[PDB]
Amino acid sequence: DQPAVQQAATEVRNAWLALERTRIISPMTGYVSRRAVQPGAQISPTTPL
Amino acid sequence: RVPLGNANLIGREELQHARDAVTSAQAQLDVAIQQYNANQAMILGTKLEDQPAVQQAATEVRNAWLALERTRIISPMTGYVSRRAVQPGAQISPTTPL
Amino acid sequence: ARQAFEKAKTALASSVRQTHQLMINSKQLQANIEVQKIALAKAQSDYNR
Numbered sequence: 001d002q003p004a005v006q007q008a009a010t011e012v013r014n015a016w017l018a019l020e021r022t023r024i025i026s027p028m029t030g031y032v033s034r035r036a037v038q039p040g041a042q043i044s045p046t047t048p049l
Numbered sequence: 050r051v052p053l054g055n056a057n058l059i060g061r062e063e064l065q066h067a068r069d070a071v072t073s074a075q076a077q078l079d080v081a082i083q084q085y086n087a088n089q090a091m092i093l094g095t096k097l098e099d100q101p102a103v104q105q106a107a108t109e110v111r112n113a114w115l116a117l118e119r120t121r122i123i124s125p126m127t128g129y130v131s132r133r134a135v136q137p138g139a140q141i142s143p144t145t146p147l
Numbered sequence: 148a149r150q151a152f153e154k155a156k157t158a159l160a161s162s163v164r165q166t167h168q169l170m171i172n173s174k175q176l177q178a179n180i181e182v183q184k185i186a187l188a189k190a191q192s193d194y195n196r
Binding site for chain 3: 012019
């Protein structure tokens with residue numbers, strides 16, 4: 001419970017979240033229409049997939 | 050010096066001062082042992098290569114090495130080249146089509 | 148992301164170790180108190196005689 005352990009745990013949780021978000025998930029039960037992502041592509045949080 | 054006191058030869062203050070000295074020496078040894086126990090919490094890991102400090106720098110070495118290995122751009126797919134907008138000497142970022 | 152995760156974990160381990168060190172320093176100071184108390188007890192015994 002000491003503060004240093006808490007801060008380090010926060011830093012580890014952020015890293016774990018960043019690592020787990022390497023799988024994109026669909027928030028909807030629909031149909032795929034305008035695919036524009038190809039393997040080997042370099043993508044950013046603004047690129048439509 | 051203890052046995053003499055049982056026979057009433059030496060003063061009582063002398064024995065008192067002997068017991069006090071022994072107790073003080075015990076306290077000092079406890080202090081030393083504790084000083085050792087701290088600084089043993091840092092060296093818990095048996096092997097030098099497994100210590101937390103060394104691994105941190107190894108991670109940075111790995112990141113730099115991946116950065117250097119990526120100066121060669123590899124094709125991800127078998128196929129045929131269609132458009133070529135890259136020339137020797139061009140300044141390239143990760144947003145420029147090639 | 149895996150590299151960053153490992154870095155965060157190393158930081159957490161280091162913080163835990165430092166906290167443990169402080170907890171041990173507490174015991175060291177207790178021992179110092181004990182020696183000083185012994186000195187006081189002797190100096191008090193001498194006066195009452």
